[PDB]
Amino acid sequence: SKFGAISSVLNDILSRLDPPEAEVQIDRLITGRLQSLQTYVTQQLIRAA
Amino acid sequence: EVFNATRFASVYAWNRTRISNCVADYSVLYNFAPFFAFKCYGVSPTKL
Numbered sequence: 001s002k003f004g005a006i007s008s009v010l011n012d013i014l015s016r017l018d019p020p021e022a023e024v025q026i027d028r029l030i031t032g033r034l035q036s037l038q039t040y041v042t043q044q045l046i047r048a049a
Numbered sequence: 050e051v052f053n054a055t056r057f058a059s060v061y062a063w064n065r066t067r068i069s070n071c072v073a074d075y076s077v078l079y080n081f082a083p084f085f086a087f088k089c090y091g092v093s094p095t096k097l
């Protein structure tokens with residue numbers, strides 16, 4: 001998922017933009033991935049109960 | 050041959066030279082023009 005950034009492939013957006021330019025896009029990716037992981041773990045806890 | 054010509058058409062008819070099958074070194078672009086605005090959006094001049 002692109003998550004509102006340049007593209008979903010970190011290896012490409014890192015070699016395409018300068019670190020400051022990618023920074024913003026990298027943070028967009030960071031928050032998307034982290035929120036998805038949090039959702040997964042919460043649902044797993046409910047299922048385990 | 051595009052940045053050192055004589056009649057850069059008018060904005061009502063914007064000319065277009067498709068460039069392919071070559072190696073692009075924009076240092077000639079840098080040295081052929083006293084740049085005033087190089088505001089790029091999809092590409093970085095540092096990595097081009």
Ligand SMILES: *[C@@H]1O[C@H](CO)[C@@H](O)[C@H](O)[C@H]1NC(C)=O
Pocket residue numbers: 053054081
């Ligand atoms: C542009 O073309 C003119 C005419 O051939 C030439 O005198 C001039 O040196 C050229 N400029 C560059 C940057 O090549």
Ligand SMILES: *[C@@H]1O[C@H](CO)[C@@H](O)[C@H](O)[C@H]1NC(C)=O
Pocket residue numbers: 050051054058064065066
């Ligand atoms: C576009 O630019 C090239 C190079 O200067 C020229 O040969 C050609 O005639 C131009 N085309 C038009 C329609 O302006």
